[PDB]
Amino acid sequence: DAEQRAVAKALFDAVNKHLSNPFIEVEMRLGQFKVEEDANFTACVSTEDYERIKTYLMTEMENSSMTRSVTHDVSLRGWRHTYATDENGNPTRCVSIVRKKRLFVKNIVVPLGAYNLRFAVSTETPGDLRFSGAGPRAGHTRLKDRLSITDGMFRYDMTQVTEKGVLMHEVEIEGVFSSHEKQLTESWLEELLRRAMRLATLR
Numbered sequence: 001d002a003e004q005r006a007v008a009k010a011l012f013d014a015v016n017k018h019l020s021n022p023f024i025e026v027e028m029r030l031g032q033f034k035v036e037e038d039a040n041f042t043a044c045v046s047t048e049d050y051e052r053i054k055t056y057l058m059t060e061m062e063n064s065s066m067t068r069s070v071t072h073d074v075s076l077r078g079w080r081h082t083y084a085t086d087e088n089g090n091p092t093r094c095v096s097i098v099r100k101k102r103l104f105v106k107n108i109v110v111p112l113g114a115y116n117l118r119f120a121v122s123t124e125t126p127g128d129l130r131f132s133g134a135g136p137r138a139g140h141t142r143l144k145d146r147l148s149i150t151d152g153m154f155r156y157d158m159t160q161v162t163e164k165g166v167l168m169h170e171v172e173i174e175g176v177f178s179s180h181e182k183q184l185t186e187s188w189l190e191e192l193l194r195r196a197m198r199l200a201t202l203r
């Protein structure tokens with residue numbers, strides 16, 4: 001509690017200078033270190049931990065708005081092309097083209113036995129949609145089966161990502177702001193830690 005307030009202030013003092021940037025995004029990702037060979041941190045949770053997180057959120061947030069989308073992402077020259085998906089899971093039309101620029105990244109200290117937490121602030125700038133002419137297979141692709149639960153200023157994202165045949169499970173929390181420059185405050189960052197720590201320690 002007392003230390004949670006300190007890290008919330010440390011996060012805010014580092015992110016404060018960036019809130020004037022348009023298209024800024026803030027996220028807290030569950031994950032773990034040294035779970036695949038060539039990577040340091042991997043933003044994934046186990047299959048059964050994903051499921052236990054799901055029912056927790058389904059029960060404690062059953063009153064909240066819930067969306068559900070299947071999309072097909074293509075990484076190409078640093079840009080991410082998002083495609084809509086048909087009944088078979090296959091790409092149709094390109095809906096958005098965005099470029100992600102990491103601004104600030106912080107590792108959150110976590111209780112022993114809980115999932116690691118990664119706090120990231122970045123810009124996701126939309127781009128010229130004519131670049132969809134490259135098609136949905138010009139680069140590495142990820143099929144994303146996302147369940148989003150929006151609760152106030154927080155959006156929980158639970159995603160099954162099929163990539164090169166293997167299916168991974170991802171859990172993250174995003175900020176839902178009308179104006180992040182005015183609404184992302186210390187007390188918001190303190191709550192983000194509270195809610196992320198709850199998911200990370202569900203065992």
Ligand SMILES: CCCn1cnc2c1c(=O)n(C)c(=O)n2C
Nearest residue numbers: 076077078079097127128129131
């Ligand atoms: C990479 C610089 C060129 N470029 C400028 N804007 C772009 C690109 C691009 O390659 N791709 C794939 C894009 O999607 N956009 C929006």
